[PDB]
Structure formats: structure tokens, C-alpha cells
Point group: D2
Chain length 239, copies 4
């Protein structure tokens, strides 16, 4: 037994979180719109969807923003083997993103398992959404500084210093009002399997039919999870 | 977070990472690769290993690949020895690189695992690998020749388990297939290493006269 | 240190710790315990579990013991969920306590393991334990009666594997031993819990009419 | 598989380090001489010896000082299962110490595995011996302060503050010179199996005999490991 981590295991429910490694460098100089490129955001959501459709593993849904994708598993893949889950999921993702963006140089996702109890699941996504807010503010904040001749580390030390209302002020003197930007930049996107009422003509027959069908749907206008609308939304995705 | 409980799982040098293609015979079907071996697939694997040594930012001593697998030797541990990080990032990078080398239309995936070794056991690790390369070589060609006789899928699979290697060899030899002279990379695998990065497609058996100091040079 | 690589291995609540006596039938021989069960040994185990709940500083919800084993339920995780620490300190404390309760002259040892559970699976865990208590009960008495017929060590061991439980029962019944009325603690084990700390030597079967809410009260 | 840590493994060589948990409280008020009780130190060494003799596990040797015992394993017990090694060793130790000291209330050792490479082993014991030095100084230092009407936390904040030459000075104004104390208080004790030349009369025969025999020996006068004498000493114990 020299493969000492190979038997290491988790139990459901579990979230797998995958995060782009150093995308700011490995995707630099490739022509992506700054500070937000909607083609990239589509590729991330499409990557989560491809995983849900073709990976053979069965997550309830995915949640993505910036460079991260979180999957919730109630049914554990590979008998819960941690090395196998982390490596295979991160690998499928690196390959799927590489196909969606037609990359010519390789990228990598990391992966980690988040060990949760059922009742803790909504709070996990609260925290991820709060991080999406913080990344929203930082990405625009950074963008604005750099446009004001700022330097790399200069803008970095800057952002840590001030406060959100402050950074809002600076953003405002550069013509940027964060309340005008699309919901998804600050809230992220949800990808899940859905069943919906379907009434159509059979492609072969072609008789009228109500035989229902399945689809993977991307939701680009999600509520804030920790809110009036958000609580039943999240609990519905989880069951 | 204290919910990321595997995140501090760690390892110590030296370590071997072994990545292995998940279900490639289904997911790479439809590229119409030649049976039972396709040197285009093998160039892609070796190139993938080379791209990793060049551009991953991690510092493996060398790589050893055959079939769907690639082993990397690290004496210098990436990510402070963090297992989840090492396994996930390395499998992900390889998945990205191979997807590029083959310009795939559908996604593939590598798995990944750490092999903990003492410095003195390192040669024996690669010997065990090369021996699995040989065993997989024999089985593939055996399977191929059988199927080409009109053998059924499962039936050929049974024949291979029943008979000994010596009989499969004789069987291949009757039909015009000589295991000893088929290309080296199929029988023994390929070594990718720095000094510039070089792919050695004609390697010695590791526990032979020339093989013993060949491996020690790679390990230093 | 970064060489103490298991030291951050962690777990999340709720958890069950199960400690089990290592090789007691050799190491506690020479105390001349009555076969096949000795209530002095069982008082020592239950007292040991009570001493742990009282004086260990850790906060288990309750304990469940039979044979050489003790299970503890924690919803509040000791040592921030650190596995090496939890397993080592709990097994050590138990080893010390049992060594006191029996005033031993030679050292014994418990092993220890964490059982990761979801809150809803907790009742089923103890049901599986109680079922192992029943199975061990049957096997012990069967072994005892056989040996007392002039059966050989290994031979009695064979008989027990061959025959079904229904036959071992009938066999015990022929000889005057009635499994149904032998003391409850032997058949079902003992529960030790706070409210003051109480040892319940007469517990329900956990998945019966009275058992179902009995377990839920212990779990809260 | 709910026993998720049960398959977790290590490879040789490995050191198991066991440390008394809170002995300062659980052994308080029991009548042990302060700040050093040689009966306690004998019990620790005898406990390591009992482990080496009766546990069935095969460590090359043990090293003990204050409340800790380190075992070096080249042959891994229980197929290298971490939960089993940590629990069983700590348990055997808690029971053996409880027998040696005839305790009436229970104690506990913790246990941790130290994953090492062969060439790293001497340096591990260097560090442990350096910690033995530091504990030597702290135990006497603390003892002296308390005798000078000092308080618990008062003496604690004190010890962290000053330096060894300073603490030596304070020790000196209380009549204490650390160079006069026994080597073992500052260097620890080594317990190992040894073979030695034996010439005696057979207890049964009783003919003169040279048939050699084995013994476990405690060495209470060990060298400093990282020194002229110490280097071949340690390398000899390890091989």
C-alpha cells in the first residue's frame, strides 16, 4: 500500500468546489473583454452544464461566478473516494472549459470537497454568494484604478484599505454605478436539470404529443439566497 | 474553512503522481484511432507530459507514460504537499493539454493519485510500471489478433485470462505477429525529461544492464 | 510540524467514536473471569464509560457498551474535530480507566475509530451495534455449551459457522439454556447517560415500540 | 463505508510521538516532588520499556522526557493504519503508566505520527532533545518563581519574556545552578533492546554457559545527539 490517500473517503452531502488556477495569467493576452467578458461567463456556465450532462456523475445543481464552480452532491460518485472525485471532476472541467473557449494553451482547475451536514447547505451557498458580491466590487474597483494609470500592486494595497461605500465613491467618480450592472455579475449563475410542460408534434410521427421531456437550464437572474424570494428558491433546488 | 476537511491532507517528498485516463476507450472513440495501438494517440500523451513539464510551473524530475497513464516524479513538492491541490490541478492541467493536443470535441478526464515512496524504493516503482506496460502490451495485441479471427468480444476476453503469456505469445507468432520486434514505445513506454525537454521513445528495460544506470541518472 | 501530516485530518459533527478492546481474551486472561460472560468485567466496562463521561472533560451525549466495545455519541466535537487527537486521547483515557476499575497487573489497550454519520442515520448506527451485540451473544453461549460437551477448540468454532442461528438456538434449548431469558445486558448491552449519570442495564431493542422513542430521547 | 479514517495509512519510517495530556492537572495533588520527581521519570522510562516488551509492536527504540515518549518504527504495525496505531499505542501507554504509578484516577496520552524520510530521522531527535532543554529551563524557572510568591499566569508571561541567560541569572539568585543537575533532566532517556556478552551458570543444569541473551536497557546518561559523541550514538540506534 503505497497509494495511501486512495482509500480516503467522504460521506454525503458534499459540495465540490472547483476554482480556476491563476486564470488572470493563463488567460491573459487572449483578448477577453475587461473586467467582465460575457463570452467567458457563458463558457463557465456551459462547462457546468456539460459536466451535468456528460460526466456520468450526478450533481443536483451547479453554482458559478468568476472562476469557480460549486457542485452539490447527494449521490456520491466513485464511492466517495476523495482523490478520485477531486482529480476527475477538476479534469473534466479543465477539458470542457478548454473546448468551450477553444484554448490553445492549457489551463487548470483545483478542486476541494466541502464536508457539510444537510441543514448547513443553504448557508454554504450564502457564503459563496457573499464572495460573489465581494469579487464583483473588487473586479470593477481594480478595473477603474488601472484605467486611472494605477499600478498592479498599488491598486491591490488600495483595495484592501478602503471600504465598500468608499470604493463605491471612487467607482462613481469614474462614471461607474454598480446598481446598473447585470444581476449575474454580482449574484452568479445556477445550472440545474429541470422538467417543464411540453406540448408538440412528434419529430417522426408527427402527431401532437404532451410526452414531457428533461432539460438542463441556466438561470442568469437568480435571487439573493439569503432573502425573502431566495430562501424557497434554494430549498427547492436542494429539496 | 473547517468544512474543507481534506484541504490540509498532506504528503512528504519524494512522491510520484500517477494520472490515468478515465474511460478513454469510450470517450476517445469516434476519433477513429487505429487498433490496437495508434501512434497519434501516443504522441499526444507524450506531448501532453512535455507541455506539463514546460508550462505547469511545477517541477517534476521526469515523466513516464504508456497506454492511458502518465507518472511524474517529484522530489520538490508542489503546493506544500497538499494532496487535494496536487491531484486536482495536475489532472486538470493534463485534461486541458490532451484536449488541445487532440483538438477534442467532447470532454475527457484523467484521475490522479499520489504514490508515497522512500527514496530507495523509487527505481522499483518504475520497474512495476514498466512491467504493467509489458502486460498491457501483450493483452492488447492478443485481443486484437483474436478479434481478427472472428472472435466475439467477451469470448476473446475469456481466452486471454485462461491462457498463459507463453501461449498468447506462441499464438501471436503463428499468425505473423512477433511481440519482440513490435515498436519499443508500445512494449516499454516513453520517458520525457529535461536535458531542453526530450522524449525518449527507445528506452531500456529498467532492471537490465543499461537500464539500471539509466534510471539512476533520471532520479539523480 | 509539516511532518505531522495526519495532525490536521479532521471530522465534522455529529460523530460516533467506537472503542474496542484489543486482544482482551489473551491480555485479561489470568483474571480468571467466568465463562462465557462475567458480570464483573461488564461492570468494569460500564463504569469505565461512566468515568469518561464524568471526568474526561469531553462531552459525549451517551455511551453504549457490550462485549469489549464502547460507542460514544458526540454532537459537540472534542479538539476541534482533530481525528488523531480524538482517537488517541479517548482510547488512552479508556485504557487508563479500565486498568483502574480492574486494578490490572499487566497493560491492556483499546483501539478507536470515528464513524461519520448524518444526523438522520444515527439511530440506524446503534441498531447495527445492538444487532452485533445479539450476534455475539448467540455465538458465545453456543461456543460455551459446545466446549462443555467435550468439543475441541477449533471444532466448536466450525460448528458455529456451519449451522444457522435457529439451530444453535434449538441446540442451546435442548441442553437447558434458554437464550430469551438470559440477562438483558448480555443480549442487548448497557446504556450510560446523563440524567447525574445513570447505567441502564435493561434497555429495549432499539427498533421496537418502546425502543424507537427511547433512542430519540438519548439523541435529543 | 462510514468509517472513513479507518483506511488512512502511513509508510515507514515513522515516529510515533505520545504526549501526556494535561498531566499538570490530572497528576496534581498526588504528592509528586516538584519540579522533578525521579519516581515519575522512572515510571515513564519503565512504561516505554513495558511497551517495547509486551505490546507486540516492534519499535527500534524509545526516547522520553517530561511527559512525552517517541517511538521509532521501521517495521510498521497494523499495516500502517493511522487510526489503529495512534489509538492502540496511546492506550497501551495510558494503561502501562497507570500500572507503574498505581494511579487511582485516569490519565490520557495523545498520539501523533511523524512522517519522516530515513535521512531526516537524526534531525527529528535533535529537535526533540532541543525541546527537552527548553522544558528543563522552563520547569526550573517556573519552580523558582512560584517559590518567590509568584502567581500562575504571572510566572507564565514572565518566562516567555526574558532570555535563557536572564532566566539563568534569576535561577542563580535562588541558589540554582542548572549545570549541577543530572544529565537526564535536560537530555531525556533512551530505552532500547540490547545484546550483551553473557557468561553464567545455567539455572537448571547448572553448567557454565556463554549462550547470549537479550535485554531492554534504559540509558539515563545519553550524549547530546548533535555533537561529536552523539552522532555515532544515534546512528547506531537507528542503523
Amino acid at each position: 500500500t503505497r497509494e495511501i490517500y486512495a482509500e480516503m473517503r467522504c460521506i454525503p452531502p458534499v459540495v465540490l468546489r472547483a476554482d480556476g488556477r491563476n486564470f488572470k495569467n493563463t488567460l491573459s493576452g487572449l483578448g477577453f473583454e475587461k473586467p467582465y467578458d460575457k463570452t467567458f461567463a457563458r463558457a463557465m456556465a456551459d462547462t457546468a452544464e456539460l459536466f451535468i450532462k456528460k460526466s456520468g456523475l450526478s450533481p443536483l445543481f451547479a453554482y458559478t461566478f468568476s472562476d469557480e464552480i460549486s457542485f452539490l452532491f447527494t449521490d456520491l460518485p466513485f464511492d466517495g473516494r476523495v482523490e478520485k472525485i477531486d482529480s476527475v471532476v477538476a479534469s473534466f472541467l479543465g477539458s470542457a472549459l478548454t473546448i468551450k473557449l477553444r484554448l490553445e494553451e492549457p489551463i487548470a482547475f483545483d478542486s476541494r470537497l466541502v464536508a457539510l451536514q444537510k441543514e448547513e447547505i443553504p448557508e454554504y451557498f450564502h457564503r459563496r454568494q457573499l464572495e460573489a458580491w465581494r469579487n464583483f466590487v473588487a473586479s470593477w474597483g481594480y478595473y477603474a484604478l488601472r484605467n486611472e494609470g494605477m499600478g498592479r500592486n498599488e491598486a491591490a494595497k488600495y483595495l484592501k484599505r478602503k471600504k465598500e461605500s468608499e470604493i463605491h465613491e471612487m467607482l462613481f467618480e469614474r462614471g461607474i454605478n454598480l446598481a446598473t450592472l447585470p444581476s449575474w455579475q454580482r449574484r452568479g449563475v445556477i445550472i440545474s436539470k429541470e422538467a417543464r410542460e411540453i406540448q408538440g408534434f412528434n419529430p417522426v410521427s408527427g402527431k401532437e404529443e404532451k410526452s414531457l421531456r428533461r432539460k438542463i437550464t441556466q438561470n442568469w437572474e437568480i435571487p439573493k439566497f439569503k432573502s425573502e424570494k431566495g430562501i424557497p428558491f434554494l430549498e427547492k433546488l436542494i429539496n
